Design an enzyme around this catalytic site. Structure first.
Site, short mmCIF file in Angstrom:
data_model
loop_
_atom_site.label_atom_id
_atom_site.label_comp_id
_atom_site.label_asym_id
_atom_site.label_seq_id
_atom_site.Cartn_x
_atom_site.Cartn_y
_atom_site.Cartn_z
N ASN B 351 0.74 -1.23 0.03
CA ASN B 351 -0.08 0.04 0.13
C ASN B 351 0.84 1.25 0.09
OD1 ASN B 351 -2.02 1.72 1.90
ND2 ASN B 351 -3.08 0.66 0.15
N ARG B 396 -0.94 4.76 0.93
CA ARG B 396 -2.07 4.95 0.02
C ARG B 396 -3.37 4.99 0.59
NH1 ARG B 396 -5.88 2.64 -4.00
NH2 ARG B 396 -5.34 3.44 -6.05
N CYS B 397 -3.71 4.34 1.39
CA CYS B 397 -4.85 4.34 2.16
C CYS B 397 -5.08 5.72 2.95
CB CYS B 397 -5.12 3.21 3.37
SG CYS B 397 -5.21 1.44 2.53
N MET B 398 -4.11 6.51 3.15
CA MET B 398 -4.07 7.59 4.17
C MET B 398 -4.26 8.84 3.05
SD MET B 398 -2.17 6.87 7.67
CE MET B 398 -0.52 6.59 6.80
#
Lengths: 409, 409
Positions: B351, B396-398
């Site tokens: 990620n 990436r998720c943040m």
């Protein structure tokens, strides 16, 4: 030697006397083998970042040393003991390690592992690998599983395999195999190190009744307090009482057994109630309606003292032990929300190590409990331990006092 | 403004073009309300140490700003938008927040909370409390439960509520209510901020088929890649295809749907496969026998293009999108043990956020993956994010890119 010159044997008659010598273990390679699917089995709440966990542990050790405490690292104690032990003892340590392996070893793997162990160049490397677990990669063999011998990941929680009790020790039959294996090192050092060899034992692993050090407390020369928890059973406290009465040199007079919630993540009494000064106790309110007490008379109760219910409320029970008005400090302090109590209790907010009366060490993360302790007049020496905390223990869990100075009651 | 001078609308036509503006959210008070018993419900692997998580997030933002990226904090974007919005829009934000509350509000609590939100003195405080959740203590009322309105603890994972798709956006119907509530803010800023108001929507929360941003990828001007995961269903991708064909200004030509393991803790395609350079991809081998693909023709497939099975192996499938041989980098690098692959995949080792071609940001903890990326010629800008990682997302998720420079393919 790992022991300083003044160390003259096990001497632990309180939970608070100035700490002289203490046993710890920085987590080694054994925590690198914790995988997502095995968290429940291995007894972890989440996987640790290993490098950071070791850095935290070094801060904890550095704080203990800054307070003139003799800190003994388990690996170094076992290796030092190995180096001076007889060949018979050196050999039996390897044999008992193999017999007690998890997973159980095939005959072929037993030979391959024995040879690998015997070929280790230094006693420290031998001890490190026995704690770490052994992979097919370490052995250079083909196998259908990567771990030929499982890690003992909980070794950094030195509070639990054995407990110092006055000038004797209890070496435990732990609840789960993953931890039972750690007691090999406990038996080895007490049976062979000259500075520990004369220590009398009040319990040993062969007794097969579950008990762990997180449940054992030495309140004063007269009274021991032992938890009835997810890890220690009341019947086991009954056998302990019998052994102590059978030992004529052991001077304890009473055992108070304390019932706590049987939560798998708050598994010992020291995760619910601790004694941090001569008259100060730290507890989690979540256990309010579960606490229950029993007394054992080690003096006039016969050769097999039975547990007798004590119906006093916690405060009165504690008062009956110290004969002073007790001060009970709640997790997260007065006025805390249930969410705050649940969170700080979860992170072992009661589990502080007292290094002198009223001076304690514990994780910085439980900020409301740290403030509550300071407001009660207890000095807190915090250290960053977020990774270590995922193993579900705090500083008390990560230590086993070997000697404490007398308390001026 | 939170937007720098050059920002002139959503412009995300790749996963790797030089990042210009990006949306993040530092976890606020909402993560202080995560309790042990609600970890699974709230979508966390463990409770975060809040103070340290916020410091880690500041370091992530500092790294972004050091690479000349305009970083927009969600709270400030919503407050800025609120201050410029019509009174009708300001009022409707409060009403929709109450209507979509979890737990569902009694009429009495609905009035008390509305009054409490109206009394907030600044728009930023209003936004902060809507995100944080509201307790009986905040309201000064007696209640059976401490939380009158639940926190939205996952807000720091801004990748998920909406996705930038070319110069349009998809605002999602998320899988779980605890996150669906976060889309209130997405709808608000896109419906009212002058710099976002002309953005066309290709999906909105009223559609009721599940899709989340971690599953959405913009590989290039022609091809979208969407995961079929624990959070996004194939039927939803079919509806998205129908919506894109109906939007005559949208120029994408193809959607490739990629099936991934349906794991609750690795819940989006971006926890299994990411694109980090023009021809470089990072994936976890654990998904090898699960990957399966479908193509949607957005040009000659009619008004309702259907998913057509694509039987190529992953390498060929990726080659059919970028038109050259892909480089596939496995989690933890070549030769890693299965334990290592399991551990680094678990901590969202795939990620990473690409900030320009072949330059990525991600947690320091996944050291073997960071080494494998560097060995493949990708620059890694690591930051310490252990607490943030317990929420089961990486960089990436943040993040949600708002604009990227065109890629010179």
């Amino acid at each position: 030697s790992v022991f300083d010159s003044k160390f003259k044997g096990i001497h632990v008659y309180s939970e608070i006397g100035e700490l002289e010598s203490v046993l710890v273990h920085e987590p080694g390679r054994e925590i690198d083998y914790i995988t997502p699917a095995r968290l429940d089995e291995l007894l972890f709440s989440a996987i640790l970042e290993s490098h950071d966990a070791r850095k935290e542990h070094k801060q904890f050790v550095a704080e203990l040393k800054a307070n003139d405490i003799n800190v003994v690292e388990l690996i170094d104690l076992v290796a030092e003991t190995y180096d001076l032990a007889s060949q018979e003892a050196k050999d039996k340590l390897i044999e008992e390690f193999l017999e007690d392996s998890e997973p159980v070893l095939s005959e072929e793997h037993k030979v391959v592992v024995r040879n690998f162990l015997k070929a280790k160049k230094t006693s420290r490397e031998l001890v490190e690998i026995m704690m770490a677990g052994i992979t097919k990669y370490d052995l250079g063999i083909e196998a259908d599983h990567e771990l030929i011998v499982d890690p003992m990941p909980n070794l950094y929680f030195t509070r639990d395999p054995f407990a110092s009790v006055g000038n004797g020790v209890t070496i435990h039959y732990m609840r789960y195999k993953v931890r039972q294996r750690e007691t090999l090192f406990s038996r080895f050092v007490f049976s062979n190190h000259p500075k520990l060899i004369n220590t009398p034992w009040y319990y040993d692993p062969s007794l097969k009744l579950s008990i762990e050090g997180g449940d054992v407390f030495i309140y004063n020369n007269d009274t021991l307090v032992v938890g009835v928890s997810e890890r220690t059973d009341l019947q086991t406290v009954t056998l302990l009482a019998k052994n102590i009465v059978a030992n004529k040199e052991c001077e304890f007079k009473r055992i108070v057994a304390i019932n706590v919630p049987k939560w798998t993540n708050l598994m010992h009494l020291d995760t619910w109630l601790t004694m941090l000064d001569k008259d100060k106790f730290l507890y989690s309110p979540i256990a309010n309606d579960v606490f229950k007490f029993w007394d054992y008379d080690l003096v006039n109760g016969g050769a097999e003292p039975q547990p007798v219910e004590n119906g006093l409320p916690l405060e009165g029970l504690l008062q009956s032990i110290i004969n002073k008005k007790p001060v009970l400090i709640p997790i997260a302090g007065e006025g805390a929300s249930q969410m705050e109590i649940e969170r700080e209790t979860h992170f072992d907010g009661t589990n502080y190590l007292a290094i002198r009366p009223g001076v304690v060490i514990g994780y910085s993360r439980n900020e409301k409990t740290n403030a509550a302790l300071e407001a009660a007049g207890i000095k807190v020496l915090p250290f960053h331990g977020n990774q270590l905390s995922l193993g579900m223990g705090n500083a008390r869990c990560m230590s086993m006092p070997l000697s404490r100075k007398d308390v001026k009651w």
